[PDB]
């Protein structure tokens, strides 16, 4: 329904929706912006991610509440309603993955854009994997493949403190721990990522230092949780 609105107007309204905490609107505006067919800038990629991460985040939180009630339950209502939320979550993930495949990833040539999108692809397959049962293995391998491609590019093209590289490794480590039942791989990735970033902090300005150390703290928090 966004086809008649100017790209610049969609971006402006996505920024307004973020300020208004209207994340479903924000996601619809950014979907419309992507469908204009132009590549996204750094700021626009962040808007897209913020919008859909907040939308899917509400769905994931709801699904976890309903799943817990359903598990303590074992009427059809809690299963039916969990299934409805689960279907809506899968629809949001499929929309995001569709935007990445048509055609954000294939047009992303720079490391910063390609790694961002491949991490996103891994993330939204990971959210699908969180609720998957029947075809879980193929969804898990799709997440792994996207994360792995992103990792290979980030190790060749970005410094170890680059915030996208750090956030990618953070999420791939969560994938290993929570999805792939590979806790030792999760811990090893988080530790190696943290240590290599630490040794690169000396190259950074004060503001880049703050950006990188914020994500490093998340790696440290998880390592503490896991060990």
């Amino acid at each position: 329904a966004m086809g008649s609105m100017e790209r610049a107007s969609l971006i402006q309204k996505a920024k307004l929706a973020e300020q208004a905490e209207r994340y479903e609107d924000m996601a619809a505006f950014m979907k419309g912006a992507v469908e204009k067919g132009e590549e996204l800038s750094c700021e626009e990629r962040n808007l897209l991610s913020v919008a859909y991460k907040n939308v899917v985040g509400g769905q994931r939180a709801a699904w976890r509440v309903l799943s817990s009630i359903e598990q303590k339950s074992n009427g059809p209502e809690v299963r039916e309603y969990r299934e409805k939320v689960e279907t809506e979550l899968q629809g949001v993930c499929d929309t995001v993955l569709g935007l990445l495949d048509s055609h954000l990833i294939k047009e992303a040539g720079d490391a910063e854009s390609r790694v961002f999108y491949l991490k996103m692809k891994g993330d939204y397959y990971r959210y699908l994997a969180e609720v998957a049962t029947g075809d879980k293995k193929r969804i898990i391998d799709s997440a792994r493949s996207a994360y792995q491609e992103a990792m290979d590019i980030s190790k060749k093209e970005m410094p170890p403190t680059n915030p996208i590289r750090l956030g990618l490794a953070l999420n791939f480590s969560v994938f290993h721990y929570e999805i792939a039942n590979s806790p030792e791989e999760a811990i090893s990735l988080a530790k190696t990522t943290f240590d290599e970033a630490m040794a690169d902090l000396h190259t950074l300005s004060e503001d880049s230092y703050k950006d990188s150390t914020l994500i490093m703290q998340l790696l440290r928090d998880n390592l503490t949780l896991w060990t």
Binding site: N46, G167, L170, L218
Partner: peptide, 9 residues
Amino acid sequence: RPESAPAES
């Protein structure tokens, strides 16, 4: 329970 990356980078 583990933390994942912020939406923005």
